[PDB]
């Protein structure tokens, strides 16, 4: 378990050392929301966790940034698109009605504006150089370039107060690890609807906002890491799984195999492993070595096996066919397969 430790120092510095970069972000950030509040469309207009303007997909790159820009929907109304359990119609004083395409809340009427007010923030910017780009992925809607190396990745997301949508019921299973009150406090928070297709005006939900209050508590005892005896390698563990996918997305870049795959699937393959090894003990900090390979063979059966079910949603397979083919498949589980038998080339 030394090489990994190693890894995860190297981490560490990049981290902690002193980095312009998300200053640059907040200005850009700030300059929209005071942009986007004007319109009567975009005035409920929030970051989703305001004071720390990022999320950082990547852990080998800290120039690549990403915001999400949440819109108070209230008296929401859904409707389950095509049994998906993941996307939904949205339906529903007139506030949105201009994205209304009849009872239902056209999402590409919504992106097309939000990509358009950005557009006319961008050039009245005097301080640092933003370039846009129109590439097409649903979203992330709008990917701004700050400078030449910082780019941020804007979502927009819809919040809804109300309970948790049915398809959720048997998600979060954090009751054995966390446990039930927990479970029953978490559910009480809200929930978001991103815009994005399952081939239609549909959006998928979104519960990225609970890590956070998952990750800063997260052992089974309410004092894991808080004392010298109690000290855990789940974070670590997260840490080198989100850099082990994305050396690996690095070294074959010139190909495509590895486009569809994500920090996203990893982090719910993580939380899978969790809720598998509940106990604090099954993450002892001198065991970072075993853990980790805990975290790699789960994530290895679900390759395999076709299955990485959504952590809120059990019915939605981030792994299906019909989402990534099994050609893609095959390939990250010989690479990675390549990587425990020769000592992670990839993090040296
Ligand atoms: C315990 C736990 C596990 C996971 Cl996987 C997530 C989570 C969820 C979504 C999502 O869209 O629903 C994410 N989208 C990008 N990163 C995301 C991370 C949140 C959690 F609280
Ligand atoms: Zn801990």
């Known amino acids: 378990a030394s090489k990994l430790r190693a890894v995860l120092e190297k981490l560490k510095l990049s981290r902690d050392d002193i980095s312009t970069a998300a200053g640059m972000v907040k200005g850009v950030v700030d300059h929209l929301l005071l942009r986007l509040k004007c319109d009567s469309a975009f005035r409920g207009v929030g970051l989703l966790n305001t004071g720390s303007y ?163 508590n997260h052992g089974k005892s309410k004092t894991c890491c808080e004392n010298k005896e109690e000290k855990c390698c789940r974070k670590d563990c997260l840490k080198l799984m989100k850099y082990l996918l994305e050396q690996l997305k690095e070294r074959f870049k010139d190909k495509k195999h590895l486009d569809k795959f994500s920090s996203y699937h990893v982090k719910t393959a993580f939380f899978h492993v969790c809720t598998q090894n509940p106990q604090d003990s099954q993450w002892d900090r001198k065991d970072l070595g075993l853990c980790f390979d805990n975290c790699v063979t789960y994530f290895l059966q679900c390759l395999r096996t076709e299955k990485l079910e959504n952590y809120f949603i059990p019915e939605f397979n981030l792994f299906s066919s019909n989402l990534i083919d099994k050609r893609s498949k095959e390939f990250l589980t010989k690479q990675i397969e390549y990587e425990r038998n020769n000592e992670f080339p990839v993090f040296d």
Do not use: C
């Open 54 to 216: 990022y999320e950082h997909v990547k852990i080998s790159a800290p120039n690549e940034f990403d915001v999400m820009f949440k819109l108070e929907v209230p008296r929401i109304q859904l409707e389950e698109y095509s049994n998906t359990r993941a996307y939904y119609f949205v339906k529903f004083e007139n506030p949105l009605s201009q994205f209304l395409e009849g009872e239902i809340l056209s999402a590409s009427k919504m992106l097309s504006k939000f990509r358009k007010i950005i557009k006319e923030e961008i050039n009245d910017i005097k301080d640092t150089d933003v370039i846009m780009k129109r590439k097409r992925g649903g979203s992330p809607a709008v990917t701004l370039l700050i400078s030449e190396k910082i780019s941020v990745d804007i979502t927009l997301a819809l919040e809804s107060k109300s309970s948790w949508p049915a398809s959720t019921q048997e998600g979060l299973r954090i009751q054995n690890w966390l446990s039930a009150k927990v479970r029953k406090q978490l559910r009480l928070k809200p929930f978001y609807l991103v815009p994005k297709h399952a081939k239609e005006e549909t959006w998928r939900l979104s519960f990225s906002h609970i890590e956070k209050e998952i990750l800063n």
